[PDB]
Amino acid sequence: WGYGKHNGPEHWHKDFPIAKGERQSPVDIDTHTAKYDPSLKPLSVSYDQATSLRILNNGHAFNVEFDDSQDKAVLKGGPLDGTYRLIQFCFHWGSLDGQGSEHTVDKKKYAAELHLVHWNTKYGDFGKAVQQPDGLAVLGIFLKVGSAKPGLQKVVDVLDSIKTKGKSADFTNFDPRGLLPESLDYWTYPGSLTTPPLLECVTWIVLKEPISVSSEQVLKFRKLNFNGEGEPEELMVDNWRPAQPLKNRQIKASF
Numbered sequence: 001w002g003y004g005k006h007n008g009p010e011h012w013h014k015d016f017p018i019a020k021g022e023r024q025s026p027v028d029i030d031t032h033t034a035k036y037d038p039s040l041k042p043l044s045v046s047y048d049q050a051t052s053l054r055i056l057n058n059g060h061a062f063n064v065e066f067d068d069s070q071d072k073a074v075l076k077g078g079p080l081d082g083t084y085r086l087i088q089f090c091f092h093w094g095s096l097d098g099q100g101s102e103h104t105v106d107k108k109k110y111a112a113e114l115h116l117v118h119w120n121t122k123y124g125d126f127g128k129a130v131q132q133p134d135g136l137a138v139l140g141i142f143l144k145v146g147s148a149k150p151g152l153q154k155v156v157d158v159l160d161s162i163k164t165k166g167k168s169a170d171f172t173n174f175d176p177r178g179l180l181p182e183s184l185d186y187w188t189y190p191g192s193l194t195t196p197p198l199l200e201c202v203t204w205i206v207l208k209e210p211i212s213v214s215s216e217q218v219l220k221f222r223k224l225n226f227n228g229e230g231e232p233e234e235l236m237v238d239n240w241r242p243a244q245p246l247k248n249r250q251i252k253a254s255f
Contacts, residue, residue, distance in 0.1 A: 001196050002060065002226060004234075009241050016196045023200040024244040025191030026102035029251055034187060037252040043184045043205065044077035045139075045177075050086060052174035055158055059165040059226055060195065061090045061239050064155065064174060068119070068126070073176065075118045075137050078205055078254070079188045084118035084137040087126055089176060091115070092194070093221045095237040097145045102194050102240050103206050105142075110210060111218055112143040113240070114179065115194075133190075135201035141181065146212035151178020156220045165228040181209035185255040194241045208255065 001007050001015065013019035050073035053065045066073055066086045073086030093112040094100030101110035116139035119129040129135030154174060161169040185208040192200040224236035 003239050012196055012198070016198050018192075018198050018200060021192070021198075021200055022247055023190050023192055023249065024198065025194050025202065025204060026104075026241060026243055027189070027191065027246050027249075027251075028104040028107055028243045029187050029206060031106050031253075034251040034253045036255065040079060040188075040252065040254040041077045042254070043075070043186065045075055045180070045184070047073045047086065047176050049073065050174075050176055052171050052176075054168050055155070055162060055171040056168035057162040057165055057224065057236075059228075061092065061236075062159070062162060062224065063088050063090045064171060071121065075116070075139060075205075078186065079203060079252070080137055080205075081134065083121045085121055086176070087117050087119055089114060089116045089179075091143075091221065092240040093143075093218065093237065094240065095222070097215075097218070099238065100240055101142055102243075103140055103142075103204075104243055110142040111145045111213070112221070114141040114143060114211075115139070116141070116176065130193075130197075130199050130201050132201055134203060135199075136193075137203050137205060140204060140206040141179065142207070142210035143213050143218070144210045145215055145218060148214035148217060149179070149211055151175075152213060152217055154178075156217050159220050159224065163223070163229075164225045167229075179211060181207055181211050183207070183209040185209065185253075187251055187253055189246075189249050189251040191249075 051067040101113040123129040
């Protein structure tokens with residue numbers, strides 16, 4: 001799989017039948033239909049003690065990994081039951097500023113989308129959680145083009161180092177707090193991973209408020225390669241999956 005014309009999103013179903021399941025993500029957030037739910041508690045993001053390890057080019061996106069052996073970077077509250085540990089974050093972006101996000105708001109597409117992946121500590125490890133309906137919590141943050149985002153510059157500058165498929169680089173002392181909007185208002189619904197194996201174990205939490213990034217920050221993302229070093233150059237852009245059918249599910253609002 002990939003995002004090309006012959007191994008793209010519309011082909012995943014062949015290898016990953018759950019592709020056309022009942023709680024697939026991403027979806028379009030119809031703000032007029034979303035239900036304001038008063039029983040929704042505020043989000044609780046404890047990342048002050050986070051420990052980054054590294055960044056790698058997995059051939060479909062780039063990941064910043066975290067040490068999740070202890071409750072260092074956690075997410076709780078909201079619609080969540082128990083503690084969820086930060087394991088990684090990655091992005092989805094497009095060829096142009098008019099495309100790239102996965103989730104859409106009233107059919108509007110953002111320049112990119114940031115996913116903070118967390119797993120339920122009740123299940124002991126990541127691999128056991130992706131076997132549960134409430135195994136993961138993904139924090140989704142939209143990126144619009146405007147002013148630079150200081151907190152993102154550290155990621156931006158190490159891209160050169162992992163241009164191709166399979167590369168990785170040490171990436172310690174990286175504070176994710178630098179990537180959060182001012183507001184923690186959100187939308188929530190039950191869905192899945194947005195990439196194969198597309199397991200339907202995620203509780204999505206899409207922040208309302210987008211973060212702005214400059215044109216040259218986003219530009220550095222478009223310089224990445226899907227291919228491995230020594231193979232024809234195929235730029236890493238449009239690594240986003242198209243909106244899926246809601247199918248009865250309901251999207252709730254904390255505001």
